[PDB]
Amino acid sequence: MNTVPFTSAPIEVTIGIDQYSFNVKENQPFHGIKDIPIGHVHVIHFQHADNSSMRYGYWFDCRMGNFYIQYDPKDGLYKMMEERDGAKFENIVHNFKERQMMVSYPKIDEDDTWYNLTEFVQMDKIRKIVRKDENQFSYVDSSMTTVQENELSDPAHSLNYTVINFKSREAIRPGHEMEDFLDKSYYLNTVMLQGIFKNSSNYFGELQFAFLNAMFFGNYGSSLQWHAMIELICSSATVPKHMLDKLDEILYYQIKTLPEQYSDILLNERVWNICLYSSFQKNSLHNTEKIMENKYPELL
Amino acid sequence: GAMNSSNYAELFNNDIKLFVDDTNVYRVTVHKTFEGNVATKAINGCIFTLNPKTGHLFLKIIHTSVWAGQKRLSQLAKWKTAEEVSALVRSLPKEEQPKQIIVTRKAMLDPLEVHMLDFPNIAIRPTELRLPFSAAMSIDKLSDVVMKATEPQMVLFNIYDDWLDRISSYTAFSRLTLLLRALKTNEESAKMILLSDPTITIKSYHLWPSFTDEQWITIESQMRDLILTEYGRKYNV
Ligand SMILES: NC(=O)CCc1c[nH]c2ccccc12
Ligand SMILES: NC(=O)CCc1c[nH]c2ccccc12
């Protein structure tokens, strides 16, 4: 079990760690989060009490280094940092634990939610979508735009998701215009899976990361990416059976975790109605269709 | 953006553009079978592709053999339309290619956009105008070449005859849309108006009769009367 030490908490802030959150008061003696499960990526995120604008946070994996949070009064945010002196970091954490100034990652033993949301998410792939090679962790916030959004303005601060565009030469083989537009199997299986992602695990990892950035930061370009990657599968008549079964599980847990009060903005009516009721895969997502109909029948 | 009443004069500027109407591409008769079920029999169709500035008509005849063994024909017809329009554009010299293609039915937007991906600078636009181009098969010479075709064939006609020698494109398009609207609303009456006087003939290379300027004014008034009436006879007013 790993730990992320905070220097201090000088400004009042709601701190999230994965799907959990807690409020910290201005100058409250808070010194970080312990008992973080090893084996998964994690995200630690922030919303200041004064400016609910800009949710922001850091994707990280404690197996890759010792990370801590320290507030910067100049840039006005809680920053993640790496401590390279392992003995300096073990000593700091040990003292804070002895003084019981850390909250414990509040995982219930029966609960596989975070695993299910991050099953295919890898830190190495996150670091290619979010390019800042000098750090082992990745910053994301509400406002960052995607490469595709930019093409349609600072490249260093963009989300480099894989561009998917159904009306593009990459998606449409000359001479197969109607075939490829109405059945996207060649774009899914040859262009994207065999060509770009290499395998379905990397495809699902980007899909899962896009959803999590949409949910935790309200990142609009990430929501677009998540829906595009769903629609590309559902609009393919030919999809490996293991991928369809896995997609149903992935989406089920995403829909299960989504805050009810955010479904209006985070769920695209056209995509979901098309995918569950019109698409080639309308009968292949049984768990997802059941949870959607019982939790968000209005959208449908 | 969409072409509408507000930006109508854009049709007659010097940027080459084409209307595409797919109404008459997939044409059928519905009939009963011996067992008493219903079936369709395709008849030859056409793509109506028109330069509204010059009157240039590129009438691509769609022979019934293109439907043989195919499913979902109404969907296929839109894609076949887009394939043929794209092939026409590629066949034209660069300086004769359109800068915009205006589709008369919004369901043609995605098929045409996908077929024209190689031409990113040609704008594909819908329209809010309810244009009467479906009535093109009420023009006798056009209907005749479509029905007689035994294979796929492109036939080039000027739909304005020689009108542009005496009137502007705006006035020519307005006359064409008036004639076609009349033919669509009451074909028999419209055709009676156009042919009532036997001494005004249709030249061999023309589609419409050789009316003088004064006779076109009378004809146009007759077509407007017909359209207003039928709008009574229909709504009882
Ligand atoms: N004691 C300090 O130097 C505060 C900042 C700091 C440096 N390295 C760290 C490692 C873990 C937590 C905090 C820190
Ligand atoms: N290629 C073009 O730009 C026009 C071709 C064309 C179609 N219909 C016509 C009628 C009269 C002269 C020319 C034509």
XYZ file of C-alpha atoms and ligand atoms in Angstrom:
565
model
C 0.000 0.000 0.000
C 1.423 3.375 -1.111
C 1.121 6.943 0.124
C 0.899 10.414 -1.412
C 2.218 13.044 1.511
C 0.925 16.581 1.227
C 3.228 19.385 2.394
C 0.174 21.211 3.800
C -3.318 22.402 2.771
C -3.178 26.218 2.674
C -6.420 26.743 0.730
C -9.822 25.149 1.235
C -10.288 22.433 -1.373
C -12.290 19.330 -2.196
C -9.733 16.581 -2.846
C -10.637 13.507 -4.840
C -8.736 10.252 -5.060
C -10.231 8.021 -7.728
C -13.989 7.895 -7.006
C -13.662 9.138 -3.408
C -13.557 12.716 -2.170
C -13.330 14.750 0.992
C -13.338 18.389 1.941
C -10.267 20.003 3.489
C -10.505 23.352 5.236
C -8.112 26.273 4.799
C -4.952 25.437 6.795
C -6.440 22.196 8.145
C -3.652 19.824 9.307
C -4.037 17.485 6.334
C -0.937 15.628 5.152
C -2.051 13.233 2.466
C -3.545 9.896 1.523
C -2.257 6.472 2.580
C -3.192 2.849 1.874
C -3.476 3.476 -1.887
C -3.839 0.128 -3.707
C -0.881 -0.948 -5.748
C -1.459 -2.334 -9.216
C -3.730 0.337 -10.686
C -3.293 3.834 -11.996
C -4.904 6.439 -9.766
C -5.994 10.053 -10.070
C -5.803 12.716 -7.382
C -7.928 15.752 -8.179
C -8.837 19.127 -6.813
C -11.623 21.661 -6.777
C -10.974 24.836 -4.852
C -13.736 26.081 -2.592
C -13.580 29.627 -3.936
C -13.332 28.789 -7.661
C -15.216 25.633 -8.600
C -14.009 26.586 -12.078
C -11.135 24.410 -13.244
C -11.213 20.990 -11.717
C -7.669 19.666 -12.176
C -5.626 16.644 -11.146
C -2.842 14.147 -11.690
C -2.793 10.598 -13.034
C -0.056 8.526 -11.405
C 1.101 4.997 -10.491
C 2.997 4.639 -7.196
C 5.123 1.860 -8.650
C 6.851 4.477 -10.824
C 8.163 6.746 -8.082
C 7.487 8.484 -4.807
C 5.062 11.363 -5.371
C 3.901 14.173 -3.050
C 1.589 17.220 -3.321
C 2.635 20.762 -2.410
C 0.598 23.944 -2.933
C 2.247 26.675 -5.052
C 1.021 30.146 -3.984
C 2.329 31.691 -7.217
C 0.566 29.451 -9.728
C -2.296 28.945 -7.288
C -2.629 25.182 -7.387
C -1.752 21.950 -5.665
C 1.155 20.481 -7.637
C 2.334 16.886 -7.800
C 6.109 16.388 -7.490
C 8.506 13.454 -7.388
C 10.903 13.050 -4.391
C 14.018 11.187 -5.607
C 15.528 10.746 -2.091
C 13.778 7.549 -0.978
C 14.965 7.899 2.618
C 13.657 11.525 2.785
C 10.271 10.335 1.518
C 9.994 7.235 3.769
C 10.892 9.383 6.784
C 8.333 12.078 5.921
C 5.545 9.489 5.379
C 6.419 7.520 8.508
C 6.213 10.694 10.650
C 2.926 11.804 9.190
C 1.384 8.339 9.709
C 2.592 8.319 13.327
C 0.823 11.650 13.863
C -2.287 10.277 12.043
C -2.495 13.258 9.706
C -3.392 11.176 6.621
C -6.690 9.875 5.332
C -6.888 6.259 4.283
C -7.918 5.293 0.768
C -11.401 4.107 1.760
C -11.690 0.976 -0.339
C -14.350 -1.553 0.638
C -13.022 -5.090 0.278
C -15.921 -6.388 -1.862
C -15.621 -3.385 -4.191
C -14.026 -3.834 -7.629
C -15.264 -0.468 -9.020
C -11.858 1.128 -9.565
C -10.347 -1.992 -11.122
C -13.338 -2.243 -13.438
C -13.003 1.395 -14.521
C -9.226 1.215 -15.088
C -8.781 -2.414 -16.214
C -7.012 -1.494 -19.479
C -5.604 1.905 -18.451
C -1.801 2.026 -18.381
C 0.372 4.888 -17.176
C 2.635 4.505 -20.196
C -0.289 5.145 -22.539
C -1.561 8.067 -20.449
C 1.860 9.702 -20.847
C 1.545 9.515 -24.643
C -1.906 11.145 -24.602
C -0.716 13.783 -22.070
C 2.802 14.745 -23.171
C 5.081 16.084 -20.418
C 8.020 13.731 -20.528
C 9.991 15.192 -17.612
C 7.373 13.936 -15.107
C 6.186 10.384 -14.436
C 2.663 11.635 -13.634
C 0.184 13.468 -15.902
C -1.770 16.676 -15.317
C -5.277 17.044 -16.738
C -7.888 19.751 -16.226
C -11.398 20.785 -17.267
C -10.241 23.145 -20.017
C -7.598 21.160 -21.938
C -8.590 20.654 -25.566
C -7.950 17.618 -27.709
C -5.840 17.400 -30.860
C -9.058 16.869 -32.843
C -10.715 19.894 -31.236
C -7.617 21.937 -32.134
C -7.746 20.911 -35.813
C -11.350 22.196 -35.995
C -4.584 26.336 -29.524
C -1.470 25.463 -27.483
C -0.170 22.019 -28.569
C 1.920 21.362 -25.432
C -1.244 21.434 -23.278
C -3.459 19.203 -25.449
C -4.980 15.756 -25.049
C -3.475 13.648 -27.866
C -6.290 11.158 -28.184
C -6.398 9.082 -31.359
C -8.362 11.021 -33.985
C -11.535 9.251 -35.134
C -13.539 10.839 -37.934
C -16.231 8.813 -39.739
C -16.166 11.095 -42.823
C -12.451 10.986 -43.580
C -10.223 9.231 -46.063
C -8.727 7.203 -43.210
C -12.209 5.819 -42.493
C -13.376 5.286 -46.092
C -11.639 3.112 -48.689
C -11.967 4.493 -52.237
C -14.563 2.362 -53.970
C -16.058 1.164 -50.683
C -17.706 4.461 -49.784
C -21.195 3.186 -48.963
C -19.922 -0.072 -47.513
C -17.366 1.509 -45.182
C -19.651 4.365 -44.085
C -22.544 2.098 -43.152
C -20.376 -0.719 -41.699
C -17.266 0.621 -39.987
C -15.614 -2.799 -39.467
C -12.632 -2.061 -41.716
C -11.938 1.228 -39.924
C -12.260 -0.499 -36.540
C -10.411 -3.721 -37.219
C -7.798 -2.807 -39.829
C -7.126 0.927 -39.447
C -7.568 1.315 -35.692
C -7.037 -2.067 -34.006
C -4.422 -3.677 -36.263
C -2.902 -0.380 -37.416
C -2.883 2.221 -34.651
C -3.790 0.659 -31.309
C -2.208 -2.737 -32.091
C -4.691 -4.594 -29.858
C -8.071 -4.176 -28.186
C -6.579 -3.681 -24.720
C -4.952 -0.406 -25.810
C -8.220 0.671 -27.485
C -10.204 0.000 -24.299
C -7.530 1.734 -22.227
C -7.919 4.974 -24.177
C -11.709 4.638 -24.089
C -11.614 4.176 -20.290
C -9.184 7.095 -19.805
C -11.371 9.374 -21.956
C -14.419 8.522 -19.849
C -12.608 9.129 -16.573
C -11.356 12.553 -17.727
C -14.887 13.431 -18.825
C -16.346 12.387 -15.485
C -13.760 13.726 -13.064
C -12.884 16.991 -14.839
C -15.909 17.677 -17.040
C -13.515 17.633 -19.966
C -15.703 18.034 -23.013
C -13.203 16.782 -25.598
C -12.707 13.624 -23.570
C -16.464 13.009 -23.556
C -16.444 13.361 -27.343
C -13.610 10.826 -27.594
C -15.352 8.300 -25.315
C -18.550 8.443 -27.358
C -16.659 8.224 -30.675
C -14.830 5.070 -29.550
C -18.121 3.491 -28.458
C -19.854 4.433 -31.671
C -17.020 3.034 -33.810
C -17.494 -0.407 -32.237
C -21.297 -0.366 -32.249
C -21.331 0.733 -35.919
C -19.168 -2.218 -36.995
C -20.997 -5.361 -38.104
C -17.876 -7.491 -37.483
C -16.361 -7.262 -33.981
C -14.509 -10.040 -32.117
C -16.825 -11.663 -29.603
C -14.431 -11.087 -26.708
C -14.414 -7.356 -27.450
C -18.210 -7.053 -27.382
C -18.453 -8.904 -24.079
C -15.679 -6.797 -22.586
C -17.211 -3.551 -23.903
C -20.517 -4.406 -22.222
C -18.670 -4.786 -18.888
C -16.674 -1.584 -19.386
C -19.714 0.556 -20.152
C -21.808 -1.047 -17.421
C -19.373 0.117 -14.749
C -19.009 3.542 -16.350
C -22.771 4.061 -16.355
C -22.990 2.650 -12.822
C -20.421 5.153 -11.506
C -21.612 8.262 -13.378
C -23.192 10.830 -11.016
C -26.928 10.835 -11.648
C -27.054 14.634 -11.722
C -24.488 14.794 -14.578
C -26.084 12.330 -17.028
C -27.757 15.211 -18.896
C -24.417 16.698 -19.981
C -22.125 13.626 -19.986
C -24.312 11.294 -22.082
C -24.935 11.950 -25.777
C -28.520 10.965 -26.574
C -27.891 10.255 -30.257
C -24.934 7.954 -29.683
C -26.585 5.933 -26.924
C -29.932 5.519 -28.683
C -28.162 4.584 -31.915
C -25.813 2.154 -30.151
C -28.387 0.361 -27.971
C -31.343 0.306 -30.398
C -30.228 0.779 -34.039
C -26.626 -0.320 -34.438
C -25.258 -3.684 -35.486
C -24.514 -4.309 -31.796
C -27.945 -3.269 -30.438
C -28.364 -6.800 -29.014
C -24.789 -7.352 -27.778
C -24.682 -4.986 -24.768
C -27.152 -6.633 -22.414
C -25.724 -5.411 -19.124
C -25.248 -1.857 -20.369
C -28.747 -1.694 -21.880
C -30.319 -2.956 -18.654
C -28.525 -0.422 -16.447
C -29.192 2.443 -18.886
C -32.912 1.652 -19.067
C -33.217 1.416 -15.255
C -31.077 4.461 -14.402
C -31.560 6.875 -17.353
C -34.788 5.953 -19.180
C -35.376 9.653 -19.927
C -32.333 9.972 -22.183
C -33.691 7.032 -24.176
C -24.781 26.763 -45.171
C -28.281 26.094 -46.484
C -29.487 27.801 -49.641
C -32.736 29.664 -48.974
C -34.851 32.660 -49.997
C -32.312 35.012 -48.409
C -29.276 33.952 -50.480
C -31.092 33.165 -53.737
C -29.048 35.515 -55.944
C -25.942 33.479 -55.139
C -27.224 30.980 -57.704
C -26.464 33.416 -60.535
C -23.007 34.632 -59.578
C -19.857 33.452 -61.321
C -18.912 30.633 -58.922
C -19.721 27.372 -60.726
C -22.380 25.394 -58.877
C -24.672 22.457 -59.549
C -28.020 21.412 -58.133
C -28.394 17.630 -57.724
C -31.895 16.147 -57.495
C -32.150 12.386 -56.824
C -35.946 12.135 -56.749
C -36.206 10.226 -60.041
C -33.209 7.919 -59.617
C -35.092 4.903 -58.175
C -38.523 4.631 -59.830
C -40.986 1.775 -59.431
C -44.468 0.620 -60.253
C -46.227 -1.229 -57.410
C -48.427 -4.165 -58.431
C -50.106 -7.353 -57.234
C -48.621 -10.821 -57.679
C -50.529 -13.922 -58.734
C -50.649 -14.984 -55.078
C -52.078 -11.567 -54.233
C -48.990 -10.112 -52.585
C -47.473 -6.794 -53.642
C -44.249 -6.388 -55.571
C -42.374 -3.593 -57.278
C -40.936 -3.404 -60.773
C -38.179 -0.843 -61.343
C -38.256 1.489 -64.342
C -35.382 3.553 -65.683
C -34.512 6.664 -63.678
C -32.217 9.648 -63.894
C -30.039 12.003 -61.853
C -30.935 15.626 -62.518
C -27.751 17.710 -62.217
C -28.217 21.324 -63.271
C -26.045 24.453 -63.482
C -28.613 27.191 -62.701
C -26.463 29.944 -64.199
C -25.943 28.402 -67.633
C -28.853 25.938 -67.927
C -26.381 23.093 -68.549
C -28.231 19.823 -67.694
C -26.144 16.592 -67.101
C -28.932 13.926 -67.219
C -27.414 10.631 -66.067
C -29.830 7.886 -67.002
C -30.099 5.113 -64.370
C -30.906 1.864 -66.134
C -32.868 -0.753 -64.216
C -29.967 -3.220 -64.500
C -28.090 -1.291 -61.799
C -30.619 -2.572 -59.217
C -30.346 -6.230 -60.179
C -29.673 -8.383 -57.122
C -29.306 -5.427 -54.803
C -31.068 -4.863 -51.474
C -32.303 -1.709 -49.743
C -32.672 0.030 -53.080
C -33.898 3.396 -51.772
C -30.740 3.653 -49.657
C -28.537 2.408 -52.479
C -30.049 4.980 -54.836
C -28.621 7.817 -52.749
C -25.137 6.291 -52.831
C -25.387 5.553 -56.556
C -26.367 9.192 -57.073
C -23.331 10.345 -55.118
C -21.053 7.928 -57.003
C -22.278 9.257 -60.371
C -22.009 12.925 -59.327
C -18.458 12.337 -58.094
C -17.575 10.608 -61.375
C -19.033 13.557 -63.304
C -16.942 16.008 -61.338
C -13.761 13.975 -61.936
C -14.588 13.861 -65.648
C -14.954 17.599 -65.912
C -11.633 19.787 -66.494
C -10.545 21.549 -63.328
C -11.784 24.949 -64.532
C -15.285 23.391 -65.236
C -15.606 21.680 -61.782
C -18.182 23.171 -59.383
C -17.197 25.084 -56.285
C -20.479 24.030 -54.629
C -23.004 21.231 -55.084
C -26.494 21.928 -53.699
C -28.559 18.806 -52.990
C -32.312 19.163 -53.167
C -32.842 16.489 -50.468
C -30.925 16.474 -47.170
C -30.568 12.697 -47.259
C -28.032 13.222 -50.071
C -25.620 15.127 -47.836
C -23.701 12.272 -46.230
C -23.490 10.072 -49.359
C -22.218 12.966 -51.459
C -19.791 14.245 -48.821
C -18.273 10.762 -48.464
C -17.914 10.305 -52.225
C -16.370 13.784 -52.567
C -13.735 13.431 -49.819
C -11.048 13.862 -52.511
C -12.530 17.352 -53.193
C -12.339 19.069 -49.785
C -12.785 22.488 -51.418
C -16.148 21.658 -53.057
C -18.891 22.709 -50.626
C -21.820 20.293 -50.269
C -24.894 22.279 -49.271
C -28.549 21.562 -48.540
C -31.396 23.884 -49.389
C -34.547 25.133 -47.691
C -36.195 25.770 -51.072
C -38.878 23.292 -52.157
C -37.680 23.036 -55.732
C -39.853 21.233 -58.269
C -37.147 19.282 -60.074
C -38.995 15.978 -59.577
C -41.283 17.150 -62.364
C -38.405 16.900 -64.846
C -39.868 13.644 -66.092
C -42.933 15.619 -67.223
C -40.750 17.218 -69.906
C -41.516 14.940 -72.835
C -38.057 14.813 -74.436
C -36.416 14.059 -71.074
C -38.908 11.310 -70.211
C -38.433 9.831 -73.707
C -34.658 9.474 -73.513
C -34.861 7.959 -70.016
C -37.527 5.403 -70.978
C -35.796 4.333 -74.204
C -32.373 3.781 -72.640
C -31.094 0.220 -72.823
C -27.910 0.847 -70.821
C -26.378 3.550 -68.605
C -26.006 6.827 -70.572
C -25.242 10.560 -69.906
C -27.279 12.975 -72.139
C -26.411 16.736 -72.168
C -29.322 19.261 -72.675
C -29.692 23.028 -72.087
C -32.852 23.255 -69.955
C -33.235 26.984 -70.836
C -33.183 26.388 -74.614
C -31.973 29.733 -76.078
C -33.627 31.894 -73.391
C -30.312 33.311 -72.190
C -29.959 35.164 -75.503
C -32.828 37.422 -74.336
C -33.140 37.104 -70.498
C -30.863 36.798 -67.488
C -30.143 33.576 -65.613
C -32.250 34.793 -62.686
C -35.269 35.224 -64.957
C -34.559 31.912 -66.738
C -34.372 29.945 -63.486
C -37.570 31.637 -62.304
C -39.331 30.628 -65.527
C -38.024 27.073 -65.248
C -39.148 26.707 -61.624
C -42.556 28.148 -62.551
C -43.025 25.697 -65.423
C -41.906 22.747 -63.336
C -44.068 23.733 -60.360
C -47.082 23.892 -62.704
C -46.270 20.500 -64.219
C -45.916 19.046 -60.711
C -49.225 20.481 -59.451
C -51.387 19.613 -62.489
C -49.430 17.991 -65.305
C -52.323 17.713 -67.757
C -53.408 21.336 -67.410
C -49.828 22.623 -67.528
C -49.171 20.633 -70.701
C -52.396 21.952 -72.250
C -51.275 25.530 -71.580
C -47.898 24.942 -73.243
C -49.283 23.265 -76.368
C -52.722 24.896 -76.777
C -51.572 26.938 -79.796
C -50.277 24.370 -82.332
C -48.461 26.983 -84.453
C -45.790 27.544 -81.769
C -43.506 24.566 -82.194
C -40.624 23.082 -80.226
C -37.379 23.180 -82.177
C -35.737 19.787 -82.687
C -32.829 20.641 -80.277
C -35.083 22.430 -77.679
C -37.354 21.137 -74.894
C -39.903 24.003 -74.702
C -41.925 25.830 -77.375
C -40.531 28.814 -79.283
C -42.591 31.538 -77.587
C -42.014 35.199 -78.288
C -41.333 37.499 -75.343
C -45.011 38.514 -75.224
C -46.169 34.890 -75.438
C -43.918 33.905 -72.512
C -45.615 36.595 -70.423
C -49.030 35.130 -71.216
C -47.804 31.565 -70.640
C -46.215 32.484 -67.319
C -49.455 34.159 -66.227
C -51.385 31.013 -67.153
C -49.013 28.843 -65.099
C -49.338 31.126 -62.074
C -53.140 30.993 -62.354
C -53.012 27.172 -62.494
C -50.803 26.965 -59.418
C -52.927 29.367 -57.351
C -56.135 27.577 -58.341
C -54.933 24.017 -57.648
C -53.962 25.471 -54.304
C -57.654 26.342 -53.980
C -59.038 23.114 -55.518
C -56.728 21.438 -52.981
C -57.377 23.569 -49.877
C -60.820 24.739 -51.092
C -60.262 28.525 -51.175
N 9.764 18.588 3.912
C 9.861 19.125 2.700
O 10.925 19.231 2.145
C 8.537 19.551 2.148
C 8.484 19.211 0.699
C 8.939 17.912 0.375
C 10.105 17.610 -0.179
N 10.148 16.175 -0.594
C 8.986 15.748 -0.120
C 8.578 14.393 -0.081
C 7.425 14.057 0.489
C 6.592 15.020 0.986
C 6.931 16.328 0.956
C 8.185 16.724 0.449
N -19.180 20.675 -69.137
C -19.929 21.781 -68.931
O -19.493 22.699 -68.267
C -21.304 21.827 -69.528
C -21.671 20.560 -70.287
C -23.072 20.646 -70.680
C -24.161 20.024 -70.127
N -25.318 20.452 -70.760
C -24.964 21.350 -71.735
C -25.772 22.048 -72.626
C -25.114 22.891 -73.492
C -23.716 23.031 -73.476
C -22.928 22.340 -72.599
C -23.552 21.488 -71.710
